[PDB]
Design a protein around this ligand. Sequence first.
Ligand code: SF4
Length: 178
Amino acid sequence: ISLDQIDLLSTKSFPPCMRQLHKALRENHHLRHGGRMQYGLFLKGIGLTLEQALQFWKQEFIKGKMDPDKFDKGYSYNIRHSFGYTPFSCLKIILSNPPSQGDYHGCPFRHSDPELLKQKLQSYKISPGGISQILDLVKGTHYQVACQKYFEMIHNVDDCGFSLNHPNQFFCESQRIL
Ligand code: SF4
């Protein structure tokens, strides 16, 4: 809800796919369509207004030396239209629009190859036990469960107490705790 708290929320309440998108956006001051879509709708879902969204996406896109006016002429329409599509679910994310080079959207558990997923989780300081467990699930295609496991670890609880199927559900479940 607070535009200047997104950096921290990334760390605690965003599932790995949205945390990645927020990261990629802050470092590259830009995201391709796949991710503007996934992360954009997700931010809407967590309750950002249309005013904050434009100020969020415009502000970051300008840090990339992008002509402020070019932004309104080539981006802002879709932000605004978004606020009058449905936030992506895990299956939609897992099953559609497979990320390519330069893309950062998708499901980390389903789209990152095993070794890169490992490194990523290691950068999030997940225990070596937890990382091993996730690698077992992922090999079995139990993506959403690996994500629940990740949820349980960064929250320090034994059972998330919910069957995951939506990035926004993860953020909610998360917020109910912290
Ligand atoms: S499992 Fe669902 S939420 Fe967890 S990352 Fe993959 S997509 Fe995002």
